[PDB]
Amino acid sequence: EAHKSEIAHRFNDVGEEHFIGLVLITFSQYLQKCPYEEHAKLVKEVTDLAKACVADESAANCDKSLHDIFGDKICALPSLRDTYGDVADCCEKKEPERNECFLHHKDDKPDLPPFARPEADVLCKAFHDDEKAFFGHYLYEVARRHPYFYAPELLYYAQKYKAILTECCEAADKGACLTPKLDALKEKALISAAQERLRCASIQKFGDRAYKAWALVRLSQRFPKADFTDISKIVTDLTKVHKECCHGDLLECADDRADLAKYMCEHQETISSHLKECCDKPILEKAHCIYGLHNDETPAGLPAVAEEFVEDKDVCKNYEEAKDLFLGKFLYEYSRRHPDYSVVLLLRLGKAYEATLKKCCATDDPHACYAKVLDEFQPLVDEPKNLVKQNCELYEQLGDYNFQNALLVRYTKKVPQVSTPTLVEISRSLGKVGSKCCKHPEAERLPCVEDYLSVVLNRLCVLHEKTPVSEKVTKCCSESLVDRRPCFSALGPDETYVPKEFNAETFTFHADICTLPETERKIKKQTALVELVKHKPHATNDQLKTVVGEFTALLDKCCSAEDKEACFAVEGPKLVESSKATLG
Ligand SMILES: O=C(O)Cc1ccccc1Nc1c(Cl)cccc1Cl
Ligand SMILES: O=C(O)Cc1ccccc1Nc1c(Cl)cccc1Cl
Ligand code: NA
């Protein structure tokens, strides 16, 4: 059917610069293993096409879908050697199968080196040398390692990075200005990637409704003075935005997100007085500001929630005749009254309210049956608090490195079939929850911890879905979204797993470790700890500290200030004996 060219429409809407960045992230996320040169080629072809179509919408290919265009550019690049498999695989398909094929190949942990950070002088020099190649490489490296990174926010990070560089690269000492600041930016962007990967998994694995309910809760806490209608409209629009982003339709995602920020800012009077801060800012800063805005204050003088949800004669009628409208109003009313609760807790409270209606509205006297419903939330609210206190005390007491080691041991004993790199990455990230949340006062501490654990446990679920080995992980991952944390927390040691019979011997890498920073060295020690627990799951915590001690020792030894060939292979069978000494 006759239409306005989609590529020209999106090119026109977002401008060349964001179009180029969004297209580079598109390619880098679909073909994570192809070199930068290849992607650069592709992005230039797409950008020449878009400019051709903007000039004359009738030009060849201008009427095609964005999927057709990305697909044909990909398939027609002979360069794509197929030394990288599956390029032909998906190119065999017609649309829409082709695009689905490219999409099903996104790898949540592609086989790549940690993103090595050059020294500050080099970094500053490359930036000065050529900004476009510098930021091209940056978007490519971050997108291909995080193939569901929320695309407009990745653009925003690139701008933030550029500001840090501009400020630090003139300084007397570049490194010391730069390093804390790149570090803080990296942590915020990792949290962003983890938050977005949970939105995408909620949509993909549990359906649009799972994310709509999550967004309803969060937005009702952020904008509690807004009416239900406006909140619902925002949720609707944000749902479309994240579905498009999570499915690789990034130009549409970015366009639609900008339109949503424009909308919210034009209606800021009836949403939040806090929006004024954001609404004066330029495009990416404006949306980023809105994305994480602090909660507005609760409106004074709202009725008791039991009026509408317990005492109304029509509770059953509304639940039966308009369930999503009634339960969504419940989530809105209850959430706007409780900014201090975690989203996941509010969703679990919504689920328990629903289950009580399902049961009670089927009886002879439903009010009698659900009268105590809102009271019956207290035990769900209170449930975490003792184990949270004890885990924050553990953290307070142990410090980061030992808290991570405690959790590594705990989670390896729970789900010991999980791959060692996954258990290490997961436990380290659980340890960051300690660090980020325990230092808040308790009223802030319980909501911080609950929602961060949901983002880390989702990382576990998605990594396990790639290499699936543990029935228990499958079960907790697939049974729910909102009970994942109680589900994992409830697991004791798996007394059923068969210990690994290990001569862990020659699991030493020719002293490779020494170009590695203290950080990676810690990861290595933590990897050995996981391996110790899988070999001896009934070992004492003290035995583990010790057999790890003998690891640290043998590390420094062959890795000293002198050069010798193969010190490790005489010492592998003999650490094997020293670990047979402490562990049996
Ligand atoms: O670990 C538990 O079972 C208690 C609990 C409940 C809710 C949220 C978090 C936690 N624990 C917890 C805390 Cl409080 C901080 C860092 C890492 C972990 Cl696993
Ligand atoms: O694991 C715990 O519950 C804390 C605890 C208490 C006493 C001794 C060791 C540990 N944890 C622990 C472990 Cl299990 C391995 C390496 C390093 C440390 Cl601090
Ligand atoms: Na797509």
Numbering used by the authors: 1 to 584
What text comes from the article?
Serum albumin (SA) is the most significant transport protein of vertebrates; it constitutes up to 60% of all plasma proteins. The whole structure is maintained by 17 disulfide bridges, which ensure durability of the overall protein fold and simultaneously allow its flexibility.
In the LSA-DIC complex, the carboxyl group of diclofenac creates the same interaction with Ser489 as present in OSA-DIC. The helix 540–550 in LSA is shifted in the C-direction almost by one turn in comparison to CSA and OSA, and tilted from Val548 towards two other helices of the IIIB domain. Additionally, Leu544 and Lys545 reduce the depth of this pocket, which partially occupies the space where the aromatic ring of diclofenac is present in the OSA-DIC and CSA-DIC complexes. This conformational change causes a rotation of the DIC2 molecule and modifies its interactions in this binding pocket, but the location of the aromatic ring functionalized by chlorine atoms stays almost in the same place due to the interaction via a halogen bond that is created between Cl2 and the amide group of Asn402 side chain. A second halogen bond is present between the Cl4 chlorine atom and oxygen OD1 of Asn541 side chain. Additionally, the hydrogen interaction between DIC2 carboxyl group and amide nitrogen ND2 of Asn541 strongly anchors the ligand molecule inside this pocket. The DIC3 molecule is present in this binding site in OSA-DIC and CSA-DIC complexes, but in LSA-DIC, this pocket is ligand-free, probably due to several sequence differences including amino acids taking part in ligand binding, as well as some side chains changing the shape and surface charge of the pocket. The flexible loop forming FA1 is the place of additional amino acid insertion in the LSA sequence that causes a loop dislocation, and together with an alteration of several amino acids, changes the architecture of the binding site.
